Amino acid sequence: SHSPASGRYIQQMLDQRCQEIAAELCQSGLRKMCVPSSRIVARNAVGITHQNTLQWRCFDTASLLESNQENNGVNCVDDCGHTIPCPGGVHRQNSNHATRHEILSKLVEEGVQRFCSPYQASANKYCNDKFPGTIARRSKGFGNNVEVAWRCYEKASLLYSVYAECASNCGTTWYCPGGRRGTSTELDKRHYTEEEGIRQAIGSVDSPCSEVEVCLPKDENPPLCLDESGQISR
């Protein structure tokens, strides 16, 4: 019934916030922002010409390109607050968007506290300490679509639509958006396999449960800590 997988709760909150922002702007007279909520998503991306940094912005999906080149791909966010390539690209002349970097950043920060597994956080911190900008997944490498290993992946090499293994809030198997296909493109090379280091980072996290409790993971912190059953007479 319920899957061991990220609910993408941060991204969901950002999209709803962006839908509210577009509606406010519509009420201020900004005609192009008067749209149903299905047209509005939050993406972290470049904007129009000269808007060349990654910022959180509210986009009208009817203005996004189906594909992107270098530079102009859009990014979504995992539940540990990392931005990862999502389908689509910014039309640099024609984009219909509203940049809202402060409020959306604040919502990401708040959402990280709720939704980010401390075991995943540890793995991500290891990777970023060692290789700035990278995050941890147990996923595919270059030119091999079967084998998985814990690696520090450059975020631009991940696909938000592809789920890959990450650490649950009990340090158990979970799956998160931002994965590899194991294909053989240049981007498929952009990672550092670190089995021992990531595993050590994961193993170093203190359990939220006592040693007389069983940790059952959840998609939001904290996990369930159930009293382990006794050596009962059955």
CB of 170 to Cl ion, least distance (A): 15
**By three-state DSSP, how is residue 28 classified?**
coil
Minimum CB separation from Cl ion for residue 172, in Å?
15
Contact stretch for Cl ion (CB under 5 A) within 43-51, 97-105, 138-146, 208-216: 97-105
Judged by CB under 5 A, which of 43, 100, 180, 190 binds Cl ion? 100
Phi and psi (nearest 5°) for 15? -65, -45
Query: Among residues 79, 165, 188, 219, which is the contact residue for Cl ion, using CB under 5 A?
Result: 79
Cβ neighbours, 10 Å, residue 6: 24
Residues of span 118-177 touching Cl ion by CB under 5 A: 176
In angstroms, the CA 39 to CA 206 distance is 42
Instruction: Return the residues of window 171-230 that contact Cl ion according to CB under 5 A.
Output: 176
Which window, 27-35, 57-65, 101-109, 144-152, contacts Cl ion (CB under 5 A)? 101-109
In sequence order, the 6+-apart residues with CB closer than 8 A to the CB of 71 are 46, 52
The Cα–Cα gap between 61 and 219 comes to 28
Smallest separation, CB 88 to Cl ion (Å): 20
Among 26, 103, 162, 187, binds Cl ion (CB under 5 A): 103
Strand partners, 215: 225
3-state secondary structure of 23: helix
- Please choose, out of 29-37, 41-49, 74-82, 124-132, the segment that lies near Cl ion by the rule CB under 5 A: 74-82
Query: Is there binding between residue 44 and Cl ion (CB under 5 A)?
Result: no
Find all residues with CB under 8 Å of 173, minimum gap 6, and list them: 4, 165
Which of 24, 102, 109, 227 is the binder for Cl ion (CB under 5 A)? 102
In contact, 111 and 220? CB cutoff 8 Å: no
Residues that bind Cl ion (CB under 5 A): 6, 78-79, 100, 102-103, 176
